[PDB]
Ligand binder design. Structure first.
Ligand SMILES: [Zn+2]
Ligand SMILES: [Zn+2]
Ligand SMILES: [Zn+2]
Ligand SMILES: [Zn+2]
Ligand SMILES: [Zn+2]
Ligand SMILES: [Zn+2]
Ligand SMILES: [Zn+2]
Lengths: 70, 783, 307
């Protein structure tokens, strides 16, 4: 099993922000977390912090990631 | 004058100085304590009151106290201050320079003689004590006039003349180089970089020379008319230039006897020779005018004081102020201060005014404290938070109205039908503005969900403002306010509704004697309305309403004294929701229209947050919030209010700017939890009546493959649903991936470097005591 | 006013904060950069790395936005721009914590000011020196932050300054996410606002008037949604000039001076804004630091003064 980034033709800020965490807004390169309903990354510490005080995706796309990452 | 700082002479921390008065008739030895700035530190030890027309002066670093003094007549008196021998040349003429080496070699310059050498150097220990003339070991510069010289090393000596520069070594009669120039006076060497020296000029053209550029042409730096002129006219020059002895590439020039400029230099290497250039000039004004010569004083911690000799010969001490060089401001309202002198950095923390008090009263730290407390998320929580902390009440009132309108929208009220009517304004409902009969009938339907032709619009306005409430619940609200303790507010509401005997009953059941006296005064009204004016009682009530401090008691006295509402509708220190309530209850159509127009036109230009009750979350509401932002620099409330209606109803760039600014501020405060809550709240409030999400979301980023059929393993089991391959297991418990509040034992943590997955709890437990990936054949510190 | 020693052996030229407000970076003329971290427990600033950076005196440094990582753009007097990225798998206070990324050897003169662009422009860089040429450097490829391209090259001076006369340069970008690209360029005795056009090339949009002497520092107030922008300038005269700009070359912009304050009676070396554009802090030749806040009106009035 290997992870593959979604390839999109971007030019500015969003090319850098496509591969960034959605809670701390930093680059993700190690120890990630990937949801399946919405394809948004998170850090390990960011997820273990956010899901204690969270119910939805931190990017606000309307996906209940605790029940829909499968 | 001539001030020369002498080193290697004091065992203690004091620094010794030698001075020559501007009359060139006296030599004084000084000791200056640098740690004390006062003039008592300048101590005068010994004075030698002889000679006459001194032209040069030097000192011996190796042997303590030995000081050579030149003369214009031609005698070089070499003696001690801390014996006394006098020498002269073989042919006596005017001495223009001097130089004492480290081992004991003493040089001399003379004027132009057609039959004698100018540069004559000898030794202290190899001269006869019974002969006045010198015995020069080496003689140079025939038919030349030496103007300045300085010893570079134990052998070589640098010299200068009226048309040439000379660097002559004692081990070879041929000079090293001869550069033609007009700038030869007062050769001074840099105490850090020995390859750079600066000479004066006849017209005052200082030039920082390089030995290597002439050794191999051009000067390294030049300054047209920098120092005072008169080099070739007066042999008694003024030392108005000093190389610094505290830091490199710095020097001081004294201009017009009053100002001192600390020139600083910049250097680069064209790749050993550093092509210098001037970066910054720091000016300092002397304490007293008419200063001829000066010198540095090295202080501790890179400090600098200046010792200066005036034209009268009086010597004082002047310090250099610690000028702040950079004043940047943090996001946490903190001030950083760097100095132009030393390296320590000053910090002002948030923890005329005081700086700490100003930085704690600033709206940046106000917004930071509110965002840490949880401002703007749930409006009832905002109102409770404001009520549980102290000066700000109109924010509490507009958040209370926002809570009322949000409860109305969430309860299904005023969202049904073909007209959305979400967070609309009182001004918008009253103005109206595709069929008039259709909008009237849907307003009637809205009334049916829960005297004047515009009775339906008045009822919608009272529903919006949260005032359509029964009399039993009015009495319950009276009891609630009485239990809270705001008897003035309860009596104000009773006067607003018109039950004056009930107001007297409410105020009479109070523990305050002032409230009881006000209750009696209001009780003097029931049998007193059917009367004309000016009967003393209305006069006293008017004076009270003018002089009293509480605005509720002010408007109570005003209405009870005069039964008119134009003295109540325009009081600025009462709630605009209450003013709208009494205006909708009592005033006529034309009077209500005039009041609404005046109040809306006032609040839109003035930026009052309580004009949102009148104007709603509309483009006019965004204009009101824009004026509030321009007035207060509060983007937090503007964002947290404009998120309720903007992506749902009207696209405008000002709301986007406020949202982006507040999110960047939350990132700068490291409030990631609050930023995520703000984002999910925007996504909750961005849903329309249908349910379509209208807010712009980040695009999808990554998906998981399985390397056999090269497809996604989960559709937007413990096997791939396409090729049937086995998912990798957690390295701790050997349990495979499963596809088809979040616990820490459900989701894998797929590192994107080594592509090795563990469960969340297993990975946290394994990386809590290790820093290596658990799968064999990998080297990746995931966590 | 508790001080901490930076540990530099010579004059500290420029100090800046990061985005989070817990890191500072100090460049100096001892050809060093030291980055300090704000301790959470002891609340006392302590060193993180102390590495020699350039071959001459470093005069201007600037942090990048944290979404692009930890990148420090150091400009010095040796005609170079050096970019430094933090590698976390290295011990603190070593000298190899901040690995070098690139040298921009496209400068023919000693630099004075370097400033990173706002985040919505990407990873853009601005470099100005005594060459009189402004060169914009872009990090186009996010896969490798070691290739930087030179795109915009606008000349701000007719001739370079003399070897002996002093000159000072300061840059300040435009932190407005819903306005076109703007840049403030203080070259000697010229304050120039450079705006991006429809063709993608910068042009002279407007010039801030006044400025009878040499300009020492320029600063752009953070746009927090107001309809007018603010630029603060400190001259070699004692004038803290706050310029008001209204914008409506797709968009034209007009420059109106809001204030001209002479409470320093010297040379205003550094003038800088706050996070929200409310507090203006200025340092002058009188040894005093003056804080400035707007009144009930829009005119600025002096507040508590730190000496
Ligand atoms: Zn993260
Ligand atoms: Zn999502
Ligand atoms: Zn999801
Ligand atoms: Zn498969
Ligand atoms: Zn497991
Ligand atoms: Zn691995
Ligand atoms: Zn890994």
């Amino acid at each position: 099993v290997l992870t593959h980034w979604i390839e999109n033709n971007e030019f500015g800020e969003e090319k850098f922000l496509a591969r960034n965490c959605n809670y701390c807004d930093l680059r993700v390169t190690r120890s990630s977390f990937i949801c399946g309903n919405c394809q948004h990354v998170l850090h390990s510490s960011c997820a273990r912090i956010w899901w204690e005080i969270g119910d939805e995706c931190p990017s606000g796309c309307g996906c209940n990631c605790p029940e829909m990452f499968d | 004058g001539l001030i020369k700082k002498v080193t290697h002479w004091s065992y203690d921390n004091l620094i010794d100085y030698l001075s020559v008065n501007p009359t060139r008739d006296e030599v004084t030895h000084y000791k200056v304590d640098p740690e004390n700035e006062s003039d008592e530190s300048i101590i005068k030890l010994h004075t030698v009151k002889d000679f006459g027309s001194i032209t040069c002066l030097d000192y011996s670093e190796s042997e303590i106290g030995m000081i050579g003094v030149g003369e214009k007549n031609g005698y070089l008196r070499i003696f001690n201050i801390s014996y006394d021998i006098r020498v002269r040349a073989k042919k006596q003429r005017c001495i223009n320079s001097l130089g004492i080496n480290t081992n004991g070699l003493i040089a001399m310059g003379l004027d132009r003689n057609k039959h004698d050498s100018s540069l004559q150097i000898w030794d202290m220990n190899y001269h006869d004590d019974s002969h006045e003339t010198i015995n020069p070991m080496f003689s140079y510069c025939t038919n030349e006039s030496i103007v300045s010289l300085k010893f570079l090393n134990d052998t070589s000596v640098l010299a200068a003349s009226t048309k040439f520069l000379k660097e002559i070594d004692v081990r070879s009669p041929n000079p090293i180089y001869q550069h033609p120039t007009r700038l030869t006076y007062d050769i001074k060497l840099n105490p850090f970089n020995d390859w750079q020296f600066s000479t004066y000029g006849d017209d005052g053209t200082l030039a920082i020379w390089d030995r290597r550029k002439l050794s191999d042409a051009s000067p390294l730096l030049t300054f047209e008319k920098l120092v005072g002129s008169g080099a070739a006219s007066r042999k008694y020059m003024n030392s108005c230039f000093r190389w610094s002895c505290v830091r490199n590439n710095e020097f001081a020039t004294l201009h017009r006897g009053d100002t001192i400029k600390r020139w600083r230099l910049g250097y680069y290497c064209d790749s050993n020779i550093e092509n210098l250039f001037v970066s910054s000039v720091h000016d300092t004004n002397t304490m007293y005018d008419r200063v001829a010569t000066f010198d540095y004083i090295p202080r501790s911690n890179n400090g600098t004081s200046l010792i200066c000799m005036r034209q009268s010969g009086t010597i004082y001490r002047m310090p250099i102020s610690e000028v702040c060089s950079k004043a940047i401001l943090n996001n946490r309202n903190s001030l950083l201060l760097s100095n132009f002198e030393n390296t320590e950095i000053d910090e002002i923390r948030v923890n005329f005014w005081k700086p700490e008090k100003l930085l704690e009263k600033d709206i940046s730290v106000i917004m930071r404290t509110r965002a840490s407390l949880g401002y703007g998320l749930d409006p009832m929580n905002t109102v409770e938070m404001i009520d549980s902390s102290k000066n700000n009440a109109y924010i509490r009132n507009t958040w209370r109205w926002i809570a009322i309108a949000k409860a109305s929208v969430d309860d299904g009220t005023m969202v049904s039908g073909d007209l959305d009517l979400g967070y609309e304004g009182v001004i918008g409902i009253w103005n109206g503005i595709l069929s008039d009969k259709q909008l009237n009938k849907e307003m009637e339907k809205i009334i049916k969900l829960r005297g004047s032709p515009k009775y339906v619009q008045r009822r919608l306005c009272l529903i919006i403002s949260g005032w359509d409430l029964s009399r039993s619940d009015y009495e319950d609200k009276y009891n609630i306010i009485m239990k809270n303790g705001h008897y003035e507010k309860a009596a104000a509401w009773a006067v607003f509704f018109g039950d004056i005997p009930k107001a007297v009953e409410i105020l009479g059941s109070a523990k305050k004697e002032r409230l009881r006296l006000i209750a009696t005064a209001i009780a003097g009204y029931l049998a007193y309305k059917d009367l004309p004016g000016n009967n003393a009682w209305r006069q006293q009530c008017r004076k009270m309403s003018s002089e009293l401090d509480d605005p509720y008691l002010r408007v109570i006295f005003a209405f009870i004294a005069d039964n008119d509402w134009w003295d109540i509708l325009y009081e600025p220190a009462i709630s605009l929701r209450e003013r709208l309530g009494v205006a909708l209850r009592f005033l006529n159509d034309t009077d209500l229209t005039t009041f609404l127009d005046r109040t809306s036109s006032t609040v839109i230009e003035n930026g009052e947050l309580e004009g949102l009750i009148l104007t709603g979350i509309t483009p006019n509401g965004i204009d009101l919030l824009q004026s509030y932002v321009n007035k207060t620099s509060d983007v937090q409330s503007a964002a947290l209010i404009s998120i309720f209606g903007s992506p749902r109803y009207f696209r405008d760039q000002r709301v986007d700017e406020w949202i982006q600014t507040y999110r960047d501020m939350l990132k700068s405060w490291e409030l990631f939890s609050m930023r995520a809550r703000f984002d999910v709240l925007r996504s909750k409030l961005s849903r329309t009546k249908t349910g379509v999400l209208t807010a712009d979301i980040k695009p999808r980023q990554i998906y998981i493959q399985c390397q056999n059929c090269k497809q996604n393993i989960n559709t937007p089991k413990y096997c791939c649903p396409h090729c049937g391959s086995s998912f990798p297991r957690c390295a701790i418990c050997l349990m495979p991936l499963g596809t088809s509040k979040l616990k820490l034992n459900e989701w894998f943590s797929f590192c994107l470097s080594c592509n090795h997955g563990m469960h969340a709890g297993h990975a946290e437990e394994w990386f809590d005591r290790h820093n290596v990936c658990p799968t064999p054949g990998c080297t990746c510190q995931c966590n | 006013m508790q001080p901490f020693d930076s540990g530099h052996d010579d004059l500290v030229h420029d100090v800046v904060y990061d985005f989070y407000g817990r890191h500072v970076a100090t460049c100096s003329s001892d050809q060093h950069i030291k980055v300090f971290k704000l301790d959470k427990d002891t609340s006392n600033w302590e060193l993180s790395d102390s590495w020699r950076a350039h071959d001459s005196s470093i005069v201007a440094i600037d942090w990048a936005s944290p979404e692009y990582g930890r990148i420090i753009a150091s400009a010095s007097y040796d005609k170079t721009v050096k970019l430094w990225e933090e590698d976390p798998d290295q011990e603190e206070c070593s000298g190899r914590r901040w690995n070098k990324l690139c040298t921009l050897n496209d400068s023919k003169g000693s630099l004075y000011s370097v400033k990173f662009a706002p985040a919505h422009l990407g990873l853009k860089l601005a470099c100005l020196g005594n060459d009189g040429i402004l060169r914009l450097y872009d990090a186009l490829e996010p896969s490798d932050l070691r290739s930087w391209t030179l795109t915009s090259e606008m000349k701000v001076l007719s001739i370079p300054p003399a070897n002996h006369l002093q000159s000072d340069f300061c840059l300040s970008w435009c932190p407005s996410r819903f306005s076109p690209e703007k840049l403030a360029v203080s070259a000697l005795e010229q304050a120039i606002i450079y705006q991006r056009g429809k063709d993608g090339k910068l042009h002279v949009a407007a010039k801030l008037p006044g400025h009878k002497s040499l300009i020492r520092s320029i600063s752009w107030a953070p746009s927090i949604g107001r309809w007018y922008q603010l630029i603060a300038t400190g001259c070699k005269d004692g004038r803290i000039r706050i310029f008001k700009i209204t914008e409506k070359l797709q968009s034209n912009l007009q420059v109106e001076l809001l204030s001209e304050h002479d409470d320093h009676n010297g040379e205003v070396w550094s003038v800088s804004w706050n996070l929200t554009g409310t507090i203006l802090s200025s340092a002058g030749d009188d040894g005093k630091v003056r804080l400035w806040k707007a009144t009930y009106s829009n005119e600025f009035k002096c507040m508590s003064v730190i000496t």
